Amino acid sequence: EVSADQVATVMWDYFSQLSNNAKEAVEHLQKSELTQQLNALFQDKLGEVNTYAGDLQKKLV
Amino acid sequence: EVSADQVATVMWDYFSQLSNNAKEAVEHLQKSELTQQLNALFQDKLGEVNTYAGDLQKKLV
Amino acid sequence: EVSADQVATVMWDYFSQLSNNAKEAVEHLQKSELTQQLNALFQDKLGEVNTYAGDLQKKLV
Amino acid sequence: EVSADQVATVMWDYFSQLSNNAKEAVEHLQKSELTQQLNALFQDKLGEVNTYAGDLQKKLV
Amino acid sequence: EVSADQVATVMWDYFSQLSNNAKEAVEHLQKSELTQQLNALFQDKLGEVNTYAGDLQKKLV
Amino acid sequence: EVSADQVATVMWDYFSQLSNNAKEAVEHLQKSELTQQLNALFQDKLGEVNTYAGDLQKKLV
Amino acid sequence: EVSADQVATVMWDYFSQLSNNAKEAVEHLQKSELTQQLNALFQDKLGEVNTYAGDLQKKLV
Amino acid sequence: EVSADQVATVMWDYFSQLSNNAKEAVEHLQKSELTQQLNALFQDKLGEVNTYAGDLQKKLV
Amino acid sequence: EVSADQVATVMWDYFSQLSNNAKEAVEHLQKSELTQQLNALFQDKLGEVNTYAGDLQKKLV
Amino acid sequence: EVSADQVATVMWDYFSQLSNNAKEAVEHLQKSELTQQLNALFQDKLGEVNTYAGDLQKKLV
């Protein structure tokens, strides 16, 4: 049992009442009740975005 | 059992009341009730996006 | 058992009340009830997008 | 058992109340009830898109 | 049992009443009731973003 | 056991998924599910009304 | 056991998913689920009304 | 046991998911779930009303 | 046991998820769940009203 | 046991999730949950009212 991964995650303008953003994540529900109402109204974000990356991932052996 | 992956994930303007963004993610539900209402209304984002990447992934042996 | 993949995932303007964005993801439901209503109304995003990538994936042996 | 794939996935303007975007993804449902209503109304996105890629995938032995 | 991963996570404009942003995260619910109302209204953030990264991840053997 | 009533019922612009408009009305439900969606949309009725009644009810002995 | 009533009921612009408009009305529910969504949207009725009644009720002995 | 009443009921612009508009009305619920969402939106009724009644009720012996 | 009443009820712009508008009304609930959301939004009624009544009630012996 | 009352009830702009508008009204609840959200928003009614009544009640012997 071994795990060595080059995991890269990017999330812009993300909306999720339930999520799992990491490995071996567990979300057990039993007889529960959730609800969302009028979330994120009248939003004006990320007018301009500039990113400079040489390269996301590498592997040299 | 070995795992060595070059996983790259990008999500822009993502909407999901339920998701799993990482490996071995578990979401067990039992007799539960969820609901979404009028989420993300009147939004104006990401007017302009610029990205510069040399290359996403590599593997040299 | 070995896994070494060059997985690249891109999602722009994604909408999914239920999804699995990573490997070995499990979503078990039992007698549950979900619902979505009027989500993502009046949206104006990603007016302009520019991307520069040398190359997504490589493999040198 | 070995897996080494150059998987590349791109999704623009994606809509799916249920999906599986990664390998070995499992979505088990039992006596559940889902529903979607008036999702993604009045949207104006991706006015212009420009992409520059040298090449998506490669394999040198 | 060994784990050595180059995990990188970025989340801009994230909204999630329930989430798991780290590995082996557990969220057990039993006969509970949650709810969200009019969260994040009239927001104007991230007018301009500039990022400079040489490269996200590396691995030299 | 006797019943002699002067009953008059008027219903204009009435909306009711479940109702009982007459005496000794019985409506038994068991493990049943009902739903109403997007009913009576875009209606324009009863623009003008003119009613002439001498009198609704009387009782002379 | 006797009943002789001068009953008059008027309902204009009435909205009720569950109602009882007559005597000895019974509405029994058991493990049942009901729901109403987006009903009576965009309506314009009863612009003008003119009613002429001598009198609603009387009782002469 | 006798009943002789001069009952008059007027309801204009009435909204009630659960009601009882007549005598000896019974509404029994057991493990039942009800809900109302986005009902009676964008309405414009009863612009002008003109009522002429000699008198509602009387009793002469 | 006798009942002879001059009962007059007027309800303009009435909102009530649960009500009892008539005598001997019974509303029994057991392990039941009710909810109301976004009801009666954007309404404009009863702009002008003109009522002419000689008198509501009388009793002559 | 006798009852002969001159009862007159007027309710303009009435809001009540739970009410009893008639005599001997019973409303029994057991392990039940009720809720009201965002009801009667953006309303404009009863702009002008003109009522002419000779007199509400009388009693002549």
Helix, strand, coil fractions of chain I, as percent rounded to 5:
0, 40, 60
Partnered with residue D26 across adjacent β-strands are: C26
Chains C and A touch (3+ CB pairs under 8 A): yes
Rounded Cα distance between F22 and C57, Å, is 73
Contacts of I37 in chain B (CB under 8 A): 37
Angle at A9 between CA A3 and CA A15, to 5 degrees: 130
Q: Which of A50, E6, J18 is nearest to B4 (CA)?
A: E6
* Set of chain I residues whose Cβ sits within 8 Å of the Cβ of J33: 32-34
From its phi and psi, is residue C56 left (phi > 0), alpha (psi between -120 and 50) or beta? Answer: alpha
- Strand intervals (E) in E1-61: 2-3, 8-15, 26-28, 48-53
Which is it for the CA torsion G38, J33, I14, J42, positive or negative? negative
The Cβ of residue I58 has, within 10 Å, a number of other Cβ atoms equal to 23
Distance between terminal CA atoms of chain B? 21
| Residue of A18, D5, G44, J37 whose CA lies nearest to C16 | A18
| Rounded distance between C-alpha atoms, residue E49 and residue E44, angstroms | 13
CB J34 within 8 A of CB I17: yes
Residue J8 to residue H57: CA distance in whole angstroms: 11
Strand partners, F52: G52
- The answer to whether residues H21 and I19 touch, using CB atoms and an 8 Å cutoff, is no
Give residue E24's region: left, alpha or beta (phi > 0; psi -120 to 50).
Answer: left
* CA-based R_g, chain J, Å: 18
Residues 6+ apart with CB under 8 A from J33: I32, I33, I34
Of A2, A10, A15, the CB nearest to B10: A10
Q: Give how far the C-alpha of residue J24 lies from the chain's centroid of Cα atoms, to the nearest Å.
A: 15
Which of B3, F45, I55 lies closest to J57 in space, CA to CA?
I55
What phi and psi values does residue H6 have, to the nearest 5 degrees?
A: -95, 85
Residue F19, token pair as written in the block: 């109702």
- Could you tell me whether strands A2-3 and G26-28 are parallel, antiparallel, or unpaired per DSSP bridges? unpaired
Quote the distance between the C-alpha of residue J15 and its chain's center.
Answer: 9
How many other β-carbons are positioned within 10 Å of the β-carbon of residue I1? 9
- F3: buried, middle or exposed (CB in 10 Å: 19+, 13-18, 0-12)? middle
Identify the DSSP state of J17: S
Structure solved via:
cryo-EM
3-class SS of residue J53:
strand
Q: Which two tokens stand for residue I59?
A: 């009793």
Q: How far is B3 from chain A (nearest CA, A)?
A: 5
How far does the CA of residue E49 sit from the closest CA of chain B (Å)? 10
Q: How many angstroms is the resolution?
A: 3.3
Residue of chain I whose Cα is closest to the Cα of G2: I2
Chains that touch I (3 or more CB pairs under 8 A): B, G, H, J
Q: What is the DSSP letter of I52?
A: E
Instruction: Give the DSSP per-residue string, H20-50.
Output: --STT-EEE-SS-B--EES-S-SB----EEE
CA–CA gap between residue F7 and residue G23 (Å, rounded)? 10
What the block records as the tokens of J37 is 């959200």
* Distance of alpha carbon J58 from alpha carbon H60, whole angstroms: 12
Q: Furthest-apart CA pair in chain A: how many Å?
A: 51
User: 3-state DSSP: chain F helix, strand, coil percent, rounded to 5?
Assistant: 0, 40, 60
Q: Is E20 helix (H, G, I), strand (E, B) or coil?
A: coil
Q: How far apart are CA G23 and CA I23, in angstroms?
A: 10
- Residue whose structure tokens are 């999630």: E16
Which of I28, H19, G19 has its CA nearest to residue J29?
I28
F7 membership: H or E segment, kind and range: strand F6-15
Contacts of B1 (CB under 8 A, 6+ apart): A1, A2, C1
H11, G12 Cβ separation under 8 angstroms? yes
CB-based contact I54:J55 (threshold 8 Å) = no
Q: Which long-range contacts (CB under 8 A, 24 or more apart) does F6-10 make?
A: F6/F57, F6/F59, F6/G4, F6/G5, F6/G6, F6/G7, F6/G57, F7/G5, F7/G7, F7/G8, F7/G22, F8/F56, F8/F57, F8/G7, F8/G8, F8/G9, F9/G8, F9/G9, F9/G11, F9/G21, F9/G22, F10/G9, F10/G10, F10/G11
Q: H36-37 and I36-37: which strand pairing?
A: parallel
The DSSP secondary structure of G2-61, one letter per residue, reads ----EEEEEEEEEE-SB---STT-EEE-SS-B--EES-S-SB----EEEEEES-S---B-
Can you spell out the DSSP letters for D1-61?
-EE----EEEEEEEE-SS---STT-EEE-SS-B----S-S-SB---SEEEEEES-S---B-
The torsion region of residue C22 among left (phi > 0), alpha (psi -120 to 50) and beta comes to beta
Residue carrying structure tokens 């009019």 = E38
Determine how many CB atoms are found less than 10 A away from the CB of residue F4.
9
Contact B1, E3 (CB under 8 A): no
CA distance linking residue H46 with residue G51, whole number of Å? 13
Whose CA is closest to E48, among B49, A13, D46, A43? B49
